[PDB]
Amino acid sequence: TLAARIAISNLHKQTTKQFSKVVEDLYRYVNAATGKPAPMISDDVYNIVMENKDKLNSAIVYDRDFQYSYFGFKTLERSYLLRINGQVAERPQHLIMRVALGIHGRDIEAALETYNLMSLKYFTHASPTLFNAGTPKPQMSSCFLVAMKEDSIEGIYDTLKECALISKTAGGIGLHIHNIRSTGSYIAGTNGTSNGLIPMIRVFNNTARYVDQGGNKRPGAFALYLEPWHADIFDFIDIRKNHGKEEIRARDLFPALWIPDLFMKRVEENGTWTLFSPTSAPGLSDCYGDEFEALYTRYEKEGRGKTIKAQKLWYSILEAQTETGTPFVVYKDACNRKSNQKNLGVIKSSNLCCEIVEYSAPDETAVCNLASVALPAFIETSEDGKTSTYNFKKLHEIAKVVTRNLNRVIDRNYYPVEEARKSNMRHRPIALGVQGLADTFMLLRLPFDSEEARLLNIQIFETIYHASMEASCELAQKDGPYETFQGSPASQGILQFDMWDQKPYGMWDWDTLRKDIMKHGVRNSLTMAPMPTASTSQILGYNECFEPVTSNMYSFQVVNPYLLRDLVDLGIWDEGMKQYLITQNGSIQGLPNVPQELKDLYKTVWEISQKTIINMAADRSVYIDQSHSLNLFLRAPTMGKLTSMHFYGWKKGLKTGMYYLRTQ
Amino acid sequence: TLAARIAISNLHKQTTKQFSKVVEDLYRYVNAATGKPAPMISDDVYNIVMENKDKLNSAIVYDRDFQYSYFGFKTLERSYLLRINGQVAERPQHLIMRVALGIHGRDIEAALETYNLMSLKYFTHASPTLFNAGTPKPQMSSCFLVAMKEDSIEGIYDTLKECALISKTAGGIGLHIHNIRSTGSYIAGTNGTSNGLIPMIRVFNNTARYVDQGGNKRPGAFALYLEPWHADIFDFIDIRKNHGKEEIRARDLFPALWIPDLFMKRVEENGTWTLFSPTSAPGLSDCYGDEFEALYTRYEKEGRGKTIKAQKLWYSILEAQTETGTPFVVYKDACNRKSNQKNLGVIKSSNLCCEIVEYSAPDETAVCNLASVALPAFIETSEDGKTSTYNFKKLHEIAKVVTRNLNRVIDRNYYPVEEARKSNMRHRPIALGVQGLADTFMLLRLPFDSEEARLLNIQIFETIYHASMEASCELAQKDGPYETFQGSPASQGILQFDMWDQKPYGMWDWDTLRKDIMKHGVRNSLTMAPMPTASTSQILGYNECFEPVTSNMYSFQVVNPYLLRDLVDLGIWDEGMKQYLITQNGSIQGLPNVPQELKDLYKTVWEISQKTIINMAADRSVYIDQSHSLNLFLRAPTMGKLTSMHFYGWKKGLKTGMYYLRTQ
Ligand SMILES: Nc1nc2c(ncn2[C@H]2C[C@H](O)[C@@H](COP(=O)(O)OP(=O)(O)OP(=O)(O)O)O2)c(=O)[nH]1
Ligand SMILES: Nc1nc2c(ncn2[C@H]2C[C@H](O)[C@@H](COP(=O)(O)OP(=O)(O)OP(=O)(O)O)O2)c(=O)[nH]1
Ligand SMILES: Nc1ncnc2c1ncn2[C@@H]1O[C@H](COP(=O)(O)OP(=O)(O)O)[C@@H](O)[C@H]1O
Ligand SMILES: Nc1ncnc2c1ncn2[C@@H]1O[C@H](COP(=O)(O)OP(=O)(O)O)[C@@H](O)[C@H]1O
Ligand SMILES: [Mg+2]
Ligand SMILES: [Mg+2]
């Protein structure tokens, strides 16, 4: 609370003020232990700063360093602000201006615009952008989707190298492994027999541990995608389990299910399910929908697999989720049917956090560059005091700024492997997200589950998607559409909500936009992918992404500042209320002297129906090009409860049915 | 004992007799589980057999299947004889003839010669030759020496792939890792910090576990070589330790020390030793001898490393050996100074079993193809009964046959990776070994430590080396010398014993041989590398390689048949003697009623001075081109005992100071 106007002030005392001078320092840096020149700013950005020192220097408002809260600034200090010899060299304002120049380069007016908006907290860029923008090999991308190159030792080891090379320069991996022959399958070259996915997973697991994002930075982070017909699927879903059989676990990796609809139909019908090695039943992962169902059903009748009860796999899935939070669940058919990248081929995975849905092949590794809008920044006390409104015009404007930022990032990015460069330059996807939906609903006096909250949510996502496609259409008018625009749904006038067979809310003129996209193209294949903001929401001091709060009281004790405000205002905030928060996980339901309106506004995620979560997720999904990282939260978790959650999500047409399952 | 004329007879009953028909069966084989045609004989050998059926068929003596003892035949049955559907398809005679044709091809007379000699047990070929000769991709090599390609994620992962590809098709790896920067070392590309050798070792460890020699055959087997100046050396030598700190161990790998003389001098002088990351002190592994000492000493004075007490490392080395049997010890300077491959560059490792000393680089992976001579087969009861002599003329003849076999193997071999093919075709090294030295000494009534045993040992190795270079000189007269002959010691008339500055024993005419080699060349850079024969001595029913017996009684109970013979002959073999063998680890020292001559002849390895072992090892070493796998055996192991063993070996000029240390 006070710690901000203390710990920040101490940083000011221990850091140089003048931006161009912190830049000189970073640039002229020499690694003392080896005597090697180790510039922390690229030649390009250094020269830009030198040729514009007065302007950039004078544009910076250091007062804005106090926009950051205690843990927010401590997050920046620990991992974001550049360091010289373990001592922090940058102030937050300097980080921001460095990022702004790293994205925009010689376009100083665009950089100044981005500096102001970010320092004023209208939006931020994902962690690797904050870390690396304007440094010598700026790897600003967060996401890589990697295709297992071939069912062969050569292809497995080439993929492993690729993952190592990507993991070296920060970034999470989603890796699909559907094509790897399962246990017991014949090996012709040596007349041997395969031990299947696990011993292969363990190699990748060790690589994730080894290659810690650049040398003592962060352990490698890989999600693995598998379709539930793969014969190794029972051991795959348990890769994170805590209990014995150590040689069969891979605890540093995350399992994710790439679920076809057929699996869900067989589960609800109480039918059979057939497990195949991909060698016995080829092509299953390279088709989807009815075409998949026809092929699967044929392979099944031809006796090419091993049949079991579907609900046997289901119960095992549900068990692993209860225990480990994993595996994730992403619906293959929804992803494929409702993707603007469908003209590229069949999409075979999502990513580490289940928000990216992009096409990947042995020669093309999908990449994404992310940023999130701070939704609370667009609340304005109305033209009379007392009432608060939402500035949708400003949000539209900011999302357009951010779209343009993320395009610049594509072009200014350093790619770890050639497969990433090829993919990104061809299709140019981007990922806009949000943070502080919860804060926004609170500030505006809208309970998460209210009809008003439901409407705001819809109109916020409509405007972000509309803004991003409008900006992307603008860029295509200047620079041409992305290489692979023609043949795409968008080229035919088919936008995300159309693929859900829905009319848009209509806060914006979609027909003019469609006419414009059909005529001129768009510069980006995809624009929307709301992400966890697990670090960046911490920096800006908002609740992560689009989830309700998990607790009105975290840990240093910190109480929901909107709730705190209310309590003192009602003359009820005392010691007796603080006690009923430290033990009560931070809940205010049932509490003696508390207005009903506060109980409705400050429900914990554990007190909101997951049916409401799914509904609002399905609502916003119609304006998400890609997917979003939907955690599900269950207090008293049972199979029938879990089951209804998955099936409700599935029948809503969600792409990401579940990220983590959070429990207790 | 009787089990042979039982279990073999049952095999006869369950297998087809006619060779060409077992061949047809193997060739026409279809993998039932996939319906894939899976021929177990190459087109080439199949056609050779078909065009020569009467001759090959009729050459085979199936009575010779009874040359194999109980565990000997069980070893063949379990892992060597080809199988159709888990049922054994080959008889031992068929395996032999297949091998003979796999090596010799269209030269039927050479194949028949090899069939007779092998079936009569004059020699055998290493396991992968027995497994793969005459199959479709015959990978007949046992040894690969792999260079870590570069101190970079790219080079580390390329090396890992290479090891995977080699491990796929059977064969042990020696991998040198001297060039990998140690813990804490700077990483420029990401401004990070290295975690050193261990987390990298763990990746290779997992690969060894994964890639089990062709799919459920044998776990991968890698030795890692490191020079003791590397800064990670304390954790490296403990990679096999049993106790806690699991993330720091690599239990499926074998550590080996590549020791420069300087280390040994500093240890005995009670001096200092400096640990370097190879980045701070480049080139140490790419020189040896005085040149190394000059460079090392300069880097040391320039303050480029971390100094400790040498005997601190020494005591740690000695500790790990006591506990784990490892690390192995191979002297870099001896290897390099006394190698015919010295014109190639500096040799940076030995191999899995410490017998191969061959040059390797990022583009050249050294390979070796091995065979062993059964030394007991050359004992002849002299021209009067009663006295036994040794047929050195026959040994010379057989070693010439074997030399020619191993050359053919070079040319007929399937290479797993291109680096192996390049190396082997350029330099063509080969490795002859021996088995049943112990049996030979017993049969002839020579105790292992006697002056007579000492002399036989010398003259046996002189004749094998002489024979092999004579045969290799012959091949160079037909086919030209190996590509890299010129510049080599041998090209200058310098043979192994010369590099020890010694005169040969002189049982053979070395001057005529030298004149011939200098004039015509030799076809092979190296010819001698006596190996463990850990499996193949089991097949032939002899004691492994050149070691004394470990026990006059193994496990089924089996007593030293030469000792048993003696006891019954002296009318002392009874129950009271069998009891003093089941408990006494199989020793006959001190025993009440046993002649002194038997006590001297049937000493266990645990009862022979390791000074005698080292002496006889140093004696034969003068006729070994490469090195040999010298296990050391210590009953009551202490630091001062271990220390004298290492230093005695070192001062003798041994290359392989120690393979395993065997203890208790
Ligand atoms: N555990 C284990 N798996 C192996 C081994 N060798 C190959 N595999 C696995 C990796 C792949 O999933 C699959 C096929 O491997 P490769 O394509 O490298 O085998 P190859 O071409 O010799 O035979 P193929 O025609 O593919 O059946 O088998 C091995 O030695 N051990
Ligand atoms: N633990 C860990 N080690 C790494 C990582 N990245 C590289 N290394 C190790 C592997 C090599 O021994 C050494 C150098 O690696 P690279 O050559 O791939 O690094 P780079 O070229 O970016 O920097 P450099 O010029 O070599 O210092 O550092 C990492 O992310 N984590
Ligand atoms: N530990 C991690 N290591 C590497 N990448 C990560 C990690 N956590 C998340 N990511 C990447 O960042 C993306 C968005 O995650 P998010 O939690 O919004 O990150 P941040 O807020 O730190 O930018 C994910 O899709 C994932 O690819
Ligand atoms: N478990 C193993 N896996 C792979 N290769 C091995 C293994 N054991 C030994 N080798 C290889 O065989 C060579 C000689 O070993 P040896 O014990 O004589 O084998 P064999 O008698 O089975 O032919 C060694 O130098 C090594 O490279
Ligand atoms: Mg293959
Ligand atoms: Mg490098």
- Report domain extents, chain A: 1-664
Structure tokens at B193: 């910090």
Best residue among B135, B168, B169 to mutate for probing ligand 1, ranked by most atoms within 8 Å of CB:
B168
Q: Which residues of B touch A200 (CB under 8 A)?
A: 210
Structure tokens at B566: 């003696």
Is the CB of B195 inside 8 Å of chain A's CB atoms? yes
Nearest to A206 among B186, B202, B213 (CB): B202
Nearest to B200 among A158, A165, A210 (CB): A210
Is residue B152 a known part of a binding site?
A: yes
Q: Do A160 and B160 touch (CB under 8 A)?
A: yes
Nearest residue to A134 via CA among A157, A163, A151, A111? A111
CA of B125, closest atom in ligand 4: 23
Distances (CA, A) of B216 to A246, A424, B164: 19, 40, 14
Is residue A525 a known part of a binding site?
A: no
- Alpha carbons B369 and B320: distance in angstroms, whole number: 31
- Alpha carbons B212 and B93: distance in angstroms, whole number: 28
CA of B142 to the centre of ligand 4 (A): 6
Is residue B484 a known part of a binding site?
A: no
CA of B150 to the centre of ligand 6 (A): 8
Asked whether the beta carbons of B371 and B124 are under 8 A apart, the reply is yes
Resolution expressed in Å:
2.2
Number of helices (H) and strands (E), helices first, in chain A?
Answer: 27, 22
Asked whether the beta carbons of B472 and B426 are under 8 A apart, the reply is no
CATH topology for A1-664 is: Anaerobic Ribonucleotide-triphosphate Reductase Large Chain (3.20.70)
Q: Given the DSSP bridges, would you call strands A186-187 and A123-125 parallel, antiparallel or unpaired?
A: unpaired
Q: Which residues of A touch B31 (CB under 8 A)?
A: 186, 188, 191
Asked whether the beta carbons of B434 and B620 are under 8 A apart, the reply is no
- Alpha carbons B158 and A640: distance in angstroms, whole number: 49
In A101-139, which positions are buried (b, 16+ CB within 10 angstroms) versus exposed (e)?
bbbbbeebebbbbbbbbbbebbbbbbbbbbbbbbbbebb
**Torsion region of A69: left, alpha or beta (phi above 0 gives left; psi -120 to 50 gives alpha):** beta
Q: Do A209 and B202 touch (CB under 8 A)?
A: yes
Q: Which residues of A touch B214 (CB under 8 A)?
A: 187, 189-192
- Alpha carbons A124 and A117: distance in angstroms, whole number: 9
CA of B199, closest atom in ligand 2: 1
CA of B533, closest atom in ligand 4: 18
Nearest to B193 among A137, A206, A215 (CB): A215
Half-sphere exposure of A273 (CA within 13 A, CB side): 26
Q: Which residues of A touch B32 (CB under 8 A)?
A: none
Calculate the CA dihedral of residues B151, B156, B157, B161 and round it to 10 degrees. Answer: 140
Which residues 209-228 of chain B have a CB within 8 Å of chain A?
A: 209-217
Question: Which ligand has its closest atom nearest to the C-alpha of A185?
Answer: 1
Nearest residue to B174 via CA among B125, B221, B139? B221
Is the CB of B132 inside 8 Å of chain A's CB atoms? no
Is the CB of B33 inside 8 Å of chain A's CB atoms? yes
Asked whether the beta carbons of A212 and A218 are under 8 A apart, the reply is yes
Method: X-ray
Is residue B153 a known part of a binding site?
A: yes
Is residue A153 a known part of a binding site?
A: yes
Q: Do B157 and A137 touch (CB under 8 A)?
A: no
> What angle, 0 to 180 degrees and rounded to 10, lies between the N-to-C axes of helices B261-268 and B639-652?
130
Structure tokens at A74: 């401590």
Best mutation target among A150, A207, A249, A418 (most B Cβ atoms within 10 Å) is A207
Q: Do A168 and B157 touch (CB under 8 A)?
A: no
Residue whose token pair is 């002030």: A9
Residues with CB under 6 A from ligand 1: A 151-153, 156, 180-181, 187-190, 194-195, 199; B 168, 210-215
Report DSSP state, residue B490: G
- The DSSP bridge partners found for residue B390 are B379
Distances (CA, A) of B396 to A590, B124, B233, B346, B388: 99, 16, 44, 32, 18
Asked whether the beta carbons of B387 and B375 are under 8 A apart, the reply is no
Between chain A and chain B, how many beta carbons pairs sit less than 8 Å apart?
Answer: 125
Q: Which residues of A touch B209 (CB under 8 A)?
A: 199, 202
Q: Do A137 and B189 touch (CB under 8 A)?
A: yes
Best mutation target among B31, B131, B137, B206 (most A Cβ atoms within 10 Å) is B206
Is the CB of A35 inside 8 Å of chain B's CB atoms? no
> Considering Cα of A297, then A303, then A306, then A311, what sign does the dihedral take?
positive
Please tell me the distance in Å from B110's CA to the nearest CA on chain A.
Answer: 28
For atom 16 of ligand 1, the residue with the nearest CA is A152
Nearest residue to B626 via CA among B281, B143, B171, B201? B143
Collapse the DSSP code of A204 into the 3-class scheme (helix H, G, I; strand E, B; otherwise coil) and give the result.
helix
CA of B196 to the centre of ligand 2 (A): 10
Residue type, B574: D
From the list A353, A354, A368, A545, the catalytic residue is A353
Q: CB under 8 Å to A16, separation ≥6 — which residues?
A: A22, A25, A89
B191 lines ligand 2 (CB under 6 A): no
B535 lines ligand 4 (CB under 6 A): yes
Collapse the DSSP code of B198 into the 3-class scheme (helix H, G, I; strand E, B; otherwise coil) and give the result.
helix
Collapse the DSSP code of A381 into the 3-class scheme (helix H, G, I; strand E, B; otherwise coil) and give the result.
strand
CA of A254 to the centre of ligand 3 (A): 13
Q: How many CB atoms lie within 10 A of CB A28?
A: 13
- Alpha carbons B3 and B314: distance in angstroms, whole number: 49
In B202-217, which positions are buried (b, 16+ CB within 10 angstroms) versus exposed (e)?
bbbbbbbbbbbbbbeb
- Alpha carbons A18 and B251: distance in angstroms, whole number: 54
Best residue among A157, A179, A194 to mutate for probing ligand 1, ranked by most atoms within 8 Å of CB:
A194
User: What backbone torsions phi and psi does residue A99 show, to the nearest 5 degrees?
Assistant: -55, -45
CA of B180, closest atom in ligand 2: 12
